[PDB]
Design a binder for this molecule. Sequence first.
Ligand SMILES: [Ca+2]
Ligand SMILES: [Ca+2]
Ligand SMILES: [Ca+2]
Ligand SMILES: [Ca+2]
Ligand SMILES: [Zn+2]
Length: 316
Amino acid sequence: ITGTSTVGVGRGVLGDQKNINTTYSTYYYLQDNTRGNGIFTYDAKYRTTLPGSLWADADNQFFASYDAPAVDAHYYAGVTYDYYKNVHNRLSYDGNNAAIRSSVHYSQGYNNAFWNGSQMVYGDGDGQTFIPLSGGIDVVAHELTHAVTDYTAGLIYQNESGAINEAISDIFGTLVEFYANKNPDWEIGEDVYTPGISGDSLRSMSDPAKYGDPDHYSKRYTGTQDNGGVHINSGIINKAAYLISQGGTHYGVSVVGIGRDKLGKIFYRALTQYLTPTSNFSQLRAAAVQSATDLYGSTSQEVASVKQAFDAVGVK
Ligand SMILES: [Ca+2]
Ligand SMILES: [Ca+2]
Ligand SMILES: [Ca+2]
Ligand SMILES: [Ca+2]
Ligand SMILES: [Zn+2]
């Protein structure tokens, strides 16, 4: 809508208070005019029609329980935008400040969130498996990262290319979580998954096998479930990414860690320069090796560690 940029205040899904950029014209809308062509957050009203209604509020205070998923979807979209801009000099998901749209209260007790090719969509969860999924900064950045992928490599959401797609979203979701310095870790969805159980998450990057995901290519899922194991075989790449950043030994292969900033640079370059819609794990290795070479030189520690990380997960 047309109006004036304002700043409201509310509480997120975790009960945390934060300021949010809004727009005033009769109502205060969840519309942040400060980032690119804007960040817009919508109410899906428990339906599956999209986007729903642009979120409108009478007083610019967002403290109702119903407000919470909207506050977080809106806020964390902004943080993710800031990450890509400040860290990778990327202006929104298309690199041209495209408007970012999110819908919350999607369906009834919906235990998921997604990027649908046009916007982000967040369920509220059933209150057992999940609380509203926008409450997770890694979740929001994971979903927004699918948009980045859509506009760059275009990785097909199937088999090895789909597993890389997923891993890319987990990697950058985690890097955004560290960027925000908001209880960061190498797990996915810990802030919104199973409110009855502390310490668990949907996926682990540091140890994918913790939750049954493969941490070596020989252990890859070969069947047809989950689009050919896109959230399963992502474990192999997530493990590689973890090792590149943090180092460690894994299946008797030693990896010297080069840190999060360099992991980000190498995978961002891979994604934007070398990966294609049908890239497989072997091609990701080559893309990451080439990227590290462009950035740090072919005899660098950075290149050596990429090779060792991929060696460790059995990807040649
Ligand atoms: Ca209000
Ligand atoms: Ca965390
Ligand atoms: Ca996390
Ligand atoms: Ca939990
Ligand atoms: Zn995903």
